[PDB]
């Protein structure tokens, strides 16, 4: 499930809007979204 990243050590970000935003939704939002995907089928 978990990805295999090429760069071993992780890196911080200045969070520019001109930088592409980085997946900021935490796991409770993903729980809500899996509930939405289950209920919309």
């Amino acid at each position: 499930s978990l990805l295999h990243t090429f760069w071993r050590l992780p890196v911080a970000v200045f969070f520019e809007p001109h930088e592409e935003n980085v997946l900021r939704c935490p796991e409770r939002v993903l729980r809500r979204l899996l509930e939405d995907a289950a209920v919309t089928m």
């Binding site: 760069w7 071993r8 050590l9 992780p10 890196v11 911080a12 970000v13």
Partner: protein
């Protein structure tokens, strides 16, 4: 209308042939240990610093702080010397083995050719032999420094034929119409003391910088406000794919071995060629100190 000069005298007698030899070196550079006014001939050049045991590196270290001067005129009374100053042009002889061009950054070097030679037979008195430092373009000086340092680094493995082949590769140096060679610093299968301590400090700072780095970047990583730091530690982690007083002593040791290497890792330009005369005996260059 006179100018501020230096009156150098000679306690030995001087022949007319030696005066005619000395008047060939009109625009020649001469180092002087302290800019006095009435100096004897014993402190002209580097014959005060010719030593059997010492080597090239201490000559370069002394030449970094010598007071360089130019000659003006020679007389049966006395000899005139001129101290240069920054931002003025002067004529200067090309006593070095390499011809120059316009705009080349020039700097002063200790003489590689040493002792008795067909070119070092200048103004040679009884106990005295006037020697002159070389005026070389800057990248050739950097090449000579690098090649002499790495020839000093191969001193402890001359038994291997491959190392002798690498030394014979390093000992020959080409340039623009210049294929001169340098003497090897190893004599009697040993290295001279100043070159030995220079390359020892080099090896020591390399060893200490390879040692202490991971703990310091690990300490710096817990205040990570710079994304250069994590790739800095990732470099060292991909390369491998302690008491606090020991830490303090190793830091001070690393910085003192760096401080003893300060004269070799950098140098300053002394002259740059405003223009060059034909026949390339001399050139008009602006002093830069």
């Amino acid at each position: 209308a006179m100018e501020a000069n230096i009156f150098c005298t000679f306690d030995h007698k001087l022949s007319i042939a030696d005066v005619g030899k000395l008047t060939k070196l009109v625009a020649a550079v001469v180092p002087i240990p302290q800019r006095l006014h009435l100096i004897k001939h014993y402190q002209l050049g580097l014959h005060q610093f010719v030593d059997h045991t010492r080597g090239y590196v201490r000559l370069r270290g002394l030449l970094r702080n010598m007071t360089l001067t130019l000659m003006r005129r020679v007389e049966g009374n006395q000899i005139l010397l001129h101290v240069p100053t920054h931002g003025l042009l002067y004529t200067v002889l090309n006593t070095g083995p390499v011809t120059w061009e316009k705009g080349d950054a020039l700097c002063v070097l200790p003489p590689l050719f040493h002792g008795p030679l067909a070119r070092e037979n200048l103004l040679t008195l009884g106990q005295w032999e006037l020697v002159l430092p070389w005026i070389v373009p800057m990248p050739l000086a950097l090449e000579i420094n690098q090649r002499l340092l790495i020839m000093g680094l191969f001193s402890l493995d001359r038994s291997y034929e491959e190392v002798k082949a690498a030394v014979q590769q390093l000992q020959t140096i080409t340039f623009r119409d210049a294929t001169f060679t340098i003497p090897d610093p190893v004599i009697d299968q040993h290295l001279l003391i100043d070159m030995k301590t220079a390359c020892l400090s080099m090896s020591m700072v390399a060893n200490l910088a390879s040692e202490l780095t991971m703990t310091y970047v690990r300490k710096l990583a817990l205040e990570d406000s710079s994304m250069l730091l994590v790739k800095c530690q990732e470099l060292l982690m991909r390369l491998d794919r302690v008491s606090p007083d020991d830490e303090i002593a190793r830091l001070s040791a690393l910085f003192v071995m760096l401080r003893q290497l300060d004269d070799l890792i950098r140098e300053q330009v002394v002259f740059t060629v405003c223009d060059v005369s034909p026949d390339n005996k001399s050139a008009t260059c602006i002093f830069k100190g």
